[PDB]
Amino acid sequence: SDFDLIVVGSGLFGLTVAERAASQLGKKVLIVEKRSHLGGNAYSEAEPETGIEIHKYGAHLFHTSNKRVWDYVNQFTAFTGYQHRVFAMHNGTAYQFPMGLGLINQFFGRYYTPDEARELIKEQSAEIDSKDATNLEEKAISLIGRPLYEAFIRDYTAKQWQTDPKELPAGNITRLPVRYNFDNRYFNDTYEGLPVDGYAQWLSNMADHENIEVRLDTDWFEVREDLRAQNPEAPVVYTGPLDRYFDYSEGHLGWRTLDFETEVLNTGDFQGTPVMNYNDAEFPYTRIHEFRHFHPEREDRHPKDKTVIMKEYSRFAEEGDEPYYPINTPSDREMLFKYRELADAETESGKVYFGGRLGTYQYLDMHMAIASALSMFDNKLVDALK
Template identity: 70%
Template sequence: MACAESSGHLSVTAGDRAFFVGHVFRPVGSPSVNLAGYDLIVVGSGFFGLTVAERVATLLNKRVLVLERRNHLGGNAYSEAEPETGIEVHRYGAHLFHTSNKRVWEYVNQFTDFTNYQHRVFTIYRGQVYPMPINLAAISQFFGRYLTPGEARALIAEQASEIVDPTAAANHEEKGISLVGRPLYDAFFRGYTAKQWQTDPRELPASIVARLPVRFDFNNRYFNDTYEGLPVHGYTAWLEKMAGHPSVDVWLSTDFFDVRDEIPAGTPIVYTGPLDRYFDYSQGWLGWRTLDFESTVLPIGDFQGTSVMNYAEEEVPYTRIHEFRHFHPERDYPTDKTVVIREYSRFANKEDEPYYPINTPEDRAKLERYRELARREAAEHNVLFGGRLGTYQYLDMHMAIGSALSMFDNKLVPYFTESHTFGAAN
């Protein structure tokens, strides 16, 4: 196939490979492929990878190639219209943008406007619906009478007193009880956690539940960040605009490990794929949780009245149901159909999409060994590791973007402008 010049971007297919085309089209395996023509190669087109690519192209005037294993842009943030209803669906689970980082907020607003959506979550337990996180409404409803903030604090403190020293809570169950007391913990956390992690809560680290707020007022916003909303035209439109710089090319359906030998030695790489995969699992496989999704189009206008409903009881096999029409009430969606997606959690195998690092003590020991290998790779071969998969940590979208901006400032700018190596202390 001949090279095709383009001032914009479009999707094409060449053989079994699809490409998101920048100003030049170069099919993999064609004699016209010239990886030496790129100043930087980014592996992965999620928020971390695209932020790096966009900043390097825009501010440093460098040519960047992004390699994406999947057949679409955007990693787990990818969204698309469900064909029967036109309702925008987040294919890898609900993605809610929120941040208190002003720099990140100003950066993302270059590429999209945001709605005023504020996320709220509810939980079904024994046929009753409660707001989440635990707040004064949930506490009062659960105990069957209105409690003032002071009464609720006193009641929770009494019920949590079986954990003598909350700071010494050794596991998820102890920490949860120290936060909300045993009755609320058993109702809303024990079963949900057990099916989310397929692990006894007494064997999980306390940090999993420590980040859930408990509120003694009626605030039922899920997030407390300064800025919150959803991209007006959807995540894919936002991501395409980030990738729209004429010096950025994105190749879809292209596995880095299939083409890495074609990359000239010394070409700088930002790798956002699985850390253990890069090193051929030499230090062992890092454990992840994955998610399965069951999508259904229903012949009704509204299934559950809200965007996300959790199911607290362990006997219900799924953890939550998403109804995506509620993310964009401003849109003209059909009134006689809706899309619901049930979410199931399980341990990931090597063929699954990883979502949440399990982070057992064994995982952390392997991670330290991989980090040492990554430091050597940066110093010796100009490879940087970033993003959720590349660092083995859970990152919200704003955290991934913020981390990418820091890498740009601290590593990529010195590399391209001052001839620093990636291994330099800067």
């Protein structure tokens, strides 16, 4: 055959499945991608004026405590020692972030020892018992009190979900969001970095194999019947939109989206930190990314006097807009459960597997997706190709 496996999509999920099949089974794998680039939403490319790497589908920071995934992805790229950190902009002052002794000192006026700070939160959050809460506004206040809630959460949350906190489930926060030390790593995980020569280089390396064929700029639904004709019992992995596979026969799945406003400024340094959250409602966007800071080890290939930055906005996502975050209304999660039924049928009837962010209506971190792929590979695909 020309191929033994067809993979729809070239996000981390497709790529992984693909590469395993190529290197571990030695099969011929054909990757079909709609866009003109490899990588799915993880893709990054250089801004033309400045040369600086940016991400046209949202900023991507790689982090995992999953050693399996880590050793794996390191097979295809090295990482930097980048540790992600964030600052929160509120009333013209940049606060340390997330919530901890640092922010606490800046906001309530003076230093609180760890023990002091636990107590400070005790009194503040005493208003509502977490067992009481009816919506998102309460449940937070019940965890950290009104002063903090109103300053750092209320508007930020509102902007991100286009809504009032009072009209959101209480179940969306599940943990005390406060640290009683000065540690402001944003992420708790074992391993963390950025791909050394960027994501594009990395993603691309995953498909650079003597058994993988990649057709960019190709829609699967336009070429499916043709390709399956060439070798009919070659199986498919579909990482595209779940609902669309089944021609929305059952209602459109509901997604949240993002609009990105990307400017080049005539300064070498606009905020001196990669990410700057904006928590006051006076501003449309949720945060400003300044991309040079993600790779400071490159700042000798960077513009002395220019910098690229990007403002992130949120809204609901519909048609033509890129889907980013599943919304998961109740009326979404059953039309899902339903499509599951369809997919399984379709998986047994016609050897077509469903995976990844779009393919399962589900938020996935990068390592999550990669693992999800590796699961499917080992559990479903090894026997499916014998």
